[PDB]
């Protein structure tokens, strides 16, 4: 009996706010959250309580503390089969990480369509609003290893496996609506250029290095996705507050055989929100697991990540009606021109039990489609269909990776494939080929049909010669970067300029910085000049005279491209730091905590040490963390209640807490004598927008602070933070 | 797409200071630096200039930009063998990382002994002062993955492969002189407890979590290496500035057959130096590759890492003469009792060409010894002998990992082993077994003898029954942690208190924190009480009455256990930031640069933008990085020359640069009007030890700064930094 007699070693099996209880495997934290795929995993879930410790052959172990030796100070003997199994298994724990998207975090959930889409697709999972499909979703970064940090500047992966009654459909997307390159043949060049450089393997998690910008400078097709990565889209606040996209145009095929082109979207029901660069970069040091942690904790709290699936639909006859090619994955389809139709809702409501078994071994591949969907000739999508099965062979050990529990379909699967490493299923069919008579030809082919039919490709006409040639329709590189740029707010544009400037300052060969500046001058002169100024580079008269690229189908902006132009803020699931002192005014703390609770906003009570402190009325306040232990980077807002403020007024960490929160544009609220901290952040007597202050935390104080939180950050403070040494 | 006309894309093939040129593969940067191992790798080095791009089968590629398609907008065709081989290789790039020590950085070098050691060992590499042995060295952290950060708090590995004339000897050590556990049977339990927890795979690179401290609190044999890890030993400034240790007692065997017990040491000739916690932790965010980069750039600059090999020698008859067991790897041998005898010097003088081929695929294993060395019954060493060969099998793909070029011996190797995956060597021997007559029994066994003999084990007497039992002599856990504690300076003790306090504050289950504090009360009550105060824990009367453990053979302290108690500072290879303004006083900059050059200290010129600034005399100064881009974290001291100080006096980043440097105890020097920055670091006008100030920079000003840098950090400022908001 090593557990404490009070039972405090075990978290409650009930939703609890982040930090209230230790985190736990999903099936222990939320045993009653169920779906068909989670139930199907029961056959392989292993418990532990009340069982004897054994070898893998079932032999009970008596002494798991010592090797067998000749004398208690003697040599270790070869006959210790128990030691040898334990060390052998440990020595072989690791498998190869994914080639890209090696860092990621995953959860279980379920999807349901709002209405039947039988008019446009015969896909079974979109046929009935009462049909619930289990999902497993993995979010990721792209460049860094599995041990790299979460809040880097990067594209994010958003991969969803739908366990449908007609097969697994994997929608393997990212958080921006285009990709960097046009033809899969370039993918190993692009990935090699962004990954750490080959002589020394630096830098991890960063595109701020020479070979990335060298490639970009030489391949202008990259500039569109580079604009999105340099914007605040490249540093999301959470996986819950970013958009998802399939990027490619795919087809939907209905029961009559009509094809409609489709791009897929996910809309975050929590709203779009990003960090600012200095915060993101410092957070990769103070908590390199911040997004993984925040996802798991949201789920444990009941703040389930919700997303709405949407389709952009274009009829077959309108394939050539835009200024860009629908098959070019470096071009987006502006929502001003083709709106997103809402199709269904996905809720992620349970964490895995074991990260290696379920997240690390999961295998998503965009070739995994079902009847009712089909591909197009997008030349990046076409090359993807080669890569995902082959790689999963070396990563996961052989051709039976579909039998790893998390990858298994929940529907029937039968065929004539046999053997391979790690073969689990024991086939009893007398035949392993077709056609056969010895088993009456079963399992049998199934003709295509409106429901439960075999897959048939749409009969698209192909015409042309065998060529290695880029379509001329793909040779336009600057109009969509310009559309993105003109769609951003003025503070979003400043942050783009700063992304480019910071990244190019890390490029050691100055001529590459110059070449990138020249590319920027083909997109927008204001952007090029402001980056050039930060780099100490002067545009030439030729560069000042480059004519801007044309508008996209007559658009000079599209506000759906901005994170912030259209308010969509949601405070539920956010977190506020409450900076305590050793005699807090309990009235302020009751008002603050209960207002946050009512809006589903979490609180962390911080102090200069761990333990407890005692409020004015004798209430015992438990401390979650110290000021340095849970820095302002990890919260959305900071509130300082009244009490004995002299206790913390000269505490450097408490003062810095506010200076850092202030620099990073977060709302700050100061009650009572906590308003003495106004001097630390240089706030004027009459106050300023973004700082809430009053004599007590009562009346409208918490409503004002929550209004600031719904707007995410205090953009109007940006000119004010430029000075301030923090 | 070519190179710039001026040749500025290619680094000069001569030693240059960090940042002066882009870094490059070692064979290109230093083509004249040779040793027998580096030359032997010439068979597999692949150039590139002037060569055609080809497939791996030698077919020249005409178009490496496009997949083969049926029409330029059509589907990709299966018959594109060029696309398929490029994508297939890419899809299989990754191999499993090492189970532990996955994050590491390596270089080539050479070793030679100071004098023949033939009276104590017959090992050929120690037999002649003019016989040089090539080495390859990898330094590592322990817990984090290969993409995790460098300046985490962790033990560091220090593994050296010696390519001797009588076989490869791998000395696989760490940077503290003991390990956490006594018997290899517990290694998978310990490693699992420190590694990310299994449900959610958090946290990376950190022991600051429940499972690690649960294990420590239940296994007090861990407390000695925990003390080391919580001290500033856990956060080295560079791999150049830490000690190494083989940990285990091994044997030396001379030509007469006499065995002497030995422990191995490496002494850094650059001296011992560590970061401070807040600096280390923020640097994991601002530069997660800091130690890898620093090592590479020291070798490029000619600041070659040098280390002295040292042996603590104990005769066989003195095995039981201490109050601890020599075979217990949780016990150190104090140098007050057994001096370290200097044996030789190692110099690392060339970087690899390709990180994956040389660093990632290197295989070190402590079972790789040579005649003249032998093992002992240390029960941790005994179990390591099982694990290194077996793991290198799944990691490196098969039993022929010795034929991977970095792992090959440079001496002859011939035997009857055959086949296995990726077999390179083509054996011509008609026999693959012995004894054989058909090849006259070649290759033949070789009797042992004084030189060039076959390996024979020392004939140690073994007497005991077959037991799984820990030796009673190993059951003492508190005396060595106490000796360590008492040998640290008062500031180093403060940092150990802070390291335990910070870590246990992140343990969510409070009882585990209480159980660790109870263990600390068995080591030293001052330590226990200082940690308990930061955790809001009160010691019980019983805990206040625990009797301290005994002294270690009469010692009350051993100063060789401290990083700083005995001055050993060497400024060559350190780096200063120079904060420029737009009209630098060129006389100051002249004096600064001349004094730094004389001592081998590098400079980095920083400003608020990139490009160039011009000094008062017309000198054009290229800017290495912005104040934000290369923070104070990355330098050893900060100097601010005069000039137009108004240009930077109100820059928030410039002021914060000094505040962070001040909080981190770094020397700061201010000339002329730069003294106005004294106000931001909120202290004295008469001056303060640690801040060098004068009307101009010159001989006396630079001398004073350089003396500060030789002492590493300004420990006297510690009490003044808790008030600074930084
Ligand atoms: C629209 C462009 C692309 C998007 C949105 C995309 C998305 C993703 C995502 C989200 C993952 C990680 C799935 C996971 O969480 O396990 C992934 C993995 C991968 N991608 Fe793609 N990708 C794209 C382009 C490509 C191209 C052109 C290729 C190669 C031809 C490729 C090869 C791979 C490979 C090798 C993996 C690792 C898969 C595995 O080990 O399971 N990707 N990609
Ligand atoms: C004194 C205690 C120990 C020290 C000093 C030690 C040192 C190290 C070092 C420095 C490396 C990294 C070598 C490299 O750079 O590639 C390493 C790797 C390894 N160690 Fe140890 N270790 C110790 C105990 C153990 C134990 C008790 C075991 C297992 C029984 C063990 C198993 C491993 C394995 C599996 C690797 C990965 C090796 C590879 O993939 O090539 N270590 N160790």
Swiss-Prot record, chains A, B:
Enzymatic class: oxidoreductase
EC?
A: 1.11.1.6
**3'-histidyl-3-tyrosine (His-Tyr) crosslink, residue number(s):** 365-388
Its induction note reads: By entry into stationary phase.
Active site per database record: 101, 174
> Could you say which cofactors this protein requires?
heme
Report the locations given in the UniProt record.
Cytoplasm
Which residues hold heme?
388
Q: Which GO terms label this protein's molecular function in UniProt?
A: catalase activity; heme binding; identical protein binding; iron ion binding
InterPro entries linked: Catalase, Catalase_AS, Catalase_clade2, Catalase_clade2_helical, Catalase_core, Catalase_haem_BS, Catalase_immune_responsive, Catalase_large_C
Keywords per UniProt: Cytoplasm, Heme, Hydrogen peroxide, Iron, Metal-binding, Oxidoreductase, Peroxidase
Show the SUPFAM superfamilies listed in the entry: Class I glutamine amidotransferase-like, Heme-dependent catalase-like
Q: List the GO biological process terms.
A: DNA damage response; hydrogen peroxide catabolic process; hyperosmotic response; response to oxidative stress
For the region Disordered, give the residue spans. 432-466
What SMART domains does this protein's entry cite? Catalase
Q: What is its main location?
A: cytoplasm
Q: Coiled-coil intervals in this record? A: none
Q: Which reaction does it catalyse?
A: 2 H2O2 = O2 + 2 H2O
Q: Name one GO cellular component term.
A: cytosol
- Which pairs of Cys residues are joined through disulfide bonds in the record? none
Quaternary structure and interacting proteins, as annotated: Homotetramer.
Q: According to its UniProt record, which protein family does this protein belong to?
A: Belongs to the catalase family. HPII subfamily.
Q: What does this protein do?
A: Decomposes hydrogen peroxide into water and oxygen; serves to protect cells from the toxic effects of hydrogen peroxide.
Q: What is this protein called?
A: Catalase HPII
């Amino acid at each position: 009996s090593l557990a404490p007699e009070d039972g405090s070693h075990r978290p409650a099996a009930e939703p609890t706010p982040p930090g209230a209880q230790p985190t736990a495997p999903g099936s222990l934290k939320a045993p009653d959250t169920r779906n068909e795929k989670l139930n199907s995993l029961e056959d392989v879930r292993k418990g532990s309580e009340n069982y004897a410790l054994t070898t893998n052959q079932g032999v009970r172990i008596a002494d798991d503390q010592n090797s067998l030796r000749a004398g208690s100070r003697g040599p270790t003997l070869l006959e210790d089969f128990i030691l040898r199994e334990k060390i052998t298994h440990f020595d072989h724990e690791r498998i190869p990480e994914r080639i890209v998207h090696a860092r990621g975090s995953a959860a279980h959930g379920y999807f349901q369509p709002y209405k039947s889409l039988s008019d446009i697709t015969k896909a079974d999972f979109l046929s009935d609003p009462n049909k619930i499909t289990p999902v497993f979703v993995r979010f990721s970064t792209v460049q860094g290893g599995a041990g790299s940090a979460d809040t880097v500047r990067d594209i994010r992966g958003f991969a969803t496996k739908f366990y449908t009654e007609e097969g697994i459909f994997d929608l393997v997307g990212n958080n921006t609506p285009i990709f960097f390159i046009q033809d899969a043949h370039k993918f190993p060049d692009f990935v090699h250029a962004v990954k750490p450089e080959p002589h020394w393997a630096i830098p991890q998690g960063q595109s701020a290095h020479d070979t990335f910008w060298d490639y970009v400078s030489l391949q202008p097709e990259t500039l569109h996705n580079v604009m999105w990565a340099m914007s605040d889209r490249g540093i999301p606040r959470s996986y819950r507050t970013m958009e998802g996209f399939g990027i490619h145009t795919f087809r939907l095929i209905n029961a009559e055989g009509k094809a409609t082109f489709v791009r897929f979207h996910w809309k975050p029901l929590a709203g779009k929100a990003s960090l600012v660069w200095d915060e993101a970069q410092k957070l990769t040091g103070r908590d390199p697991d911040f997004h993984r942690r925040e996802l798991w904790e949201a789920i444990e709290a009941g703040d389930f990540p919700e997303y709405e699936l949407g389709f952009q639909l274009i009829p077959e006859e309108d394939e050539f009606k835009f200024d860009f090619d629908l098959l070019d994955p470096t071009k987006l389809i502006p929502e001003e021109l083709v709106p997103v139709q809402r199709v269904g809702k996905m809720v992620l409501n349970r964490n895995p039990d074991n990260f290696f078994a379920e997240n690390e071994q999961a295998a998503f591949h965009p070739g995994h489609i079902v009847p009712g969907l089909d591909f197009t000739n997008d030349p990046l999508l076409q090359g993807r269909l080669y890569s995902y099965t082959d790689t999963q062979i070396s990563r996961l050990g052989g051709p039976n990776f579909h039998e790893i529990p998390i990858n298994r379909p929940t529907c029937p699967y039968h065929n004539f494939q046999r053997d391979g490493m790690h073969r689990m299923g024991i086939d009893t069919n007398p035949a392993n080929y077709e056609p056969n008579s010895i088993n009456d030809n079963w399992p049998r082919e199934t003709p295509p049909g409106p429901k439960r039919g075999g897959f048939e490709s749409y009969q698209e006409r192909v015409e042309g010669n065998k060529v290695r040639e880029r379509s001329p329709s793909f040779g336009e590189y600057y109009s969509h970067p310009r559309l993105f740029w003109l769609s951003q707010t003025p503070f979003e544009q400043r942050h783009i300029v700063d992304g480019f400037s910071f990244e190019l300052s890390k490029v050691v060969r100055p001529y590459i910085r110059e070449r990138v500046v020249d590319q920027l001058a083909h997109i927008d002169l204001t952007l090029a000049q402001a980056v050039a100024k930060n780099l100490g580079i002067e545009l030439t008269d030729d560069q000042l005279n480059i004519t801007p690229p044309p508008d996209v189908n007559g658009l000079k902006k599209d506000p759906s491209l901005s994170l912030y132009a259209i308010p969509d803020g949601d405070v539920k699931g956010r977190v506020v730091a409450i900076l305590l002192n050793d005699e807090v005014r309990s009235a302020d703390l009751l008002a603050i905590l209960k207002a946050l609770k009512a809006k589903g906003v979490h609180a962390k009570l911080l102090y200069s040490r761990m333990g407890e402190v005692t409020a004015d009325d004798g209430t015992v306040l438990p401390i979650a963390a110290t000021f340095a232990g849970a820095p302002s980077l990890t919260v959305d807002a900071v509130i300082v209640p009244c009490g004995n403020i002299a206790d913390i007024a000269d505490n450097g960490d408490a003062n810095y807490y506010l200076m850092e929160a202030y620099k990073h544009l977060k709302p700050i609220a100061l009650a009572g004598d906590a308003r003495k901290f106004k001097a630390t952040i240089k706030i004027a007597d009459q106050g300023e927008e973004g700082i809430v202050e009053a004599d007590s935390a009562d009346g409208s104080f918490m409503d004002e602070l929550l209004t600031l939180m719904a707007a995410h950050r205090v953009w109007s403070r940006i000119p004010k933070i430029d000075k301030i040494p923090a």
